[PDB]
Amino acid sequence: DVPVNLYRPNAPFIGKVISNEPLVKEGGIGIVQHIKFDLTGGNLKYIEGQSIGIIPPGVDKNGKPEKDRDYSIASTRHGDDVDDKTISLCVRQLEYKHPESGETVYGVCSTYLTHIEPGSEVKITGPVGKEMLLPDDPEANVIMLATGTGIAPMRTYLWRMFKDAERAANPEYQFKGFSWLVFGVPTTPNILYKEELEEIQQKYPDNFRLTYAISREQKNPQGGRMYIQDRVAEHADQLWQLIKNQKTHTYICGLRGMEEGIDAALSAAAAKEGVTWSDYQKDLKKAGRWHVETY
Numbered sequence: 001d002v003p004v005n006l007y008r009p010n011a012p013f014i015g016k017v018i019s020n021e022p023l024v025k026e027g028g029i030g031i032v033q034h035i036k037f038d039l040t041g042g043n044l045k046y047i048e049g050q051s052i053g054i055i056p057p058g059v060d061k062n063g064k065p066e067k068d069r070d071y072s073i074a075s076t077r078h079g080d081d082v083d084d085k086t087i088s089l090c091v092r093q094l095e096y097k098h099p100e101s102g103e104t105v106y107g108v109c110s111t112y113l114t115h116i117e118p119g120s121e122v123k124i125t126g127p128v129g130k131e132m133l134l135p136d137d138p139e140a141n142v143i144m145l146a147t148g149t150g151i152a153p154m155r156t157y158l159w160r161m162f163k164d165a166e167r168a169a170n171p172e173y174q175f176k177g178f179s180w181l182v183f184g185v186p187t188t189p190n191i192l193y194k195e196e197l198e199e200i201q202q203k204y205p206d207n208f209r210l211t212y213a214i215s216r217e218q219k220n221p222q223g224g225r226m227y228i229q230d231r232v233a234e235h236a237d238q239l240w241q242l243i244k245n246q247k248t249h250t251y252i253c254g255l256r257g258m259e260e261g262i263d264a265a266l267s268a269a270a271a272k273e274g275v276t277w278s279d280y281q282k283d284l285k286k287a288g289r290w291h292v293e294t295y
């Protein structure tokens with residue numbers, strides 16, 4: 001049922017860039033781009049929570065062809081125009097230290113993508129992944145814990161749940177549960193898709209809650225910068241009470257490092273009721289109700 005590896009590295013789909021828009025507003029940190037690709041002329045299909053590969057041009061420092069890099073799909077199965085013709089990505093330009101030889105180092109595939117022009121052809125593989133799928137059950141509770149580009153699979157969920165055109169296109173999924181996104185970014189200009197998330201919470205106050213952790217604008221109770229683990233700690237009891245429901249799913253996505261603090265906070269909440277979270281969590285994972293994609 002789930003589409004997987006309709007295209008592979010040895011024979012990728014050659015798509016075309018339709019658009020490449022900035023998601024970091026003025027005064028933000030770094031570069032994050034929303035990139036939409038044209039799927040017509042191939043049979044790439046996908047669903048929410050999946051990823052695709054991009055193969056960038058060029059050779060590495062050893063003269064070898066650059067390999068596939070994976071990116072979370074940021075559009076629903078229908079694409080952003082709900083026409084089943086496109087796919088979108090949410091791509092950060094990787095750049096970093098002199099402690100790697102040079103000045104700023106720029107990631108190969110992410111710089112290629114963030115600066116790519118409409119009309120350009122791109123090698124696309126996939127889709128891949130079965131561990132970040134949304135339940136078919138419209139009454140499920142969905143907790144979403146995202147930092148940075150980890151917003152990508154959450155966008156596919158929330159758009160399927162809450163976009164008018166999606167609801168009209170998806171007879172069998174009329175979401176009536178409760179979802180709660182905790183989203184960590186450094187600044188308010190760095191809140192990817194801010195306007196549309198806040199629009200969704202406004203329209204569906206009983207079905208969507210939005211919580212920000214903004215490190216350059218907020219301090220945790222210990223006086224440090226506010227991170228997502230701080231917000232999960234602040235709301236640990238609320239989150240644990242939701243997690244106790246047999247129909248609750250939790251999704252974690254972002255750059256690696258968030259999980260440790262999320263676990264310590266939930267562990268303290270569950271312990272009050274004589275539950276060891278690490279054991280409860282293994283069971284959730286086994287049941288397919290604890291989903292993690294970090295990188």
Ligand SMILES: Cc1cc2nc3c(=O)[nH]c(=O)nc-3n(C[C@H](O)[C@H](O)[C@H](O)COP(=O)(O)OP(=O)(O)OC[C@H]3O[C@@H](n4cnc5c(N)ncnc54)[C@H](O)[C@@H]3O)c2cc1C
Pocket residue numbers: 051069070071072073090091092093094095096097100106107108109110111149150152293294295
């Ligand atoms: C399942 C999955 C989904 C992903 N989804 C997304 C997504 O939606 N959006 C997105 O932007 N990315 C996503 N990523 C990461 C993405 O695949 C690429 O790793 C990333 O874009 C960087 O690739 P590059 O080609 O730009 O960098 P490369 O040129 O491949 O450079 C990467 C290398 O630089 C180093 N490095 C990384 N960060 C630092 C740092 N600050 N300090 C020091 N060295 C560093 C390491 O050596 C790393 O191997 C995802 C990864 C996976 C596995």
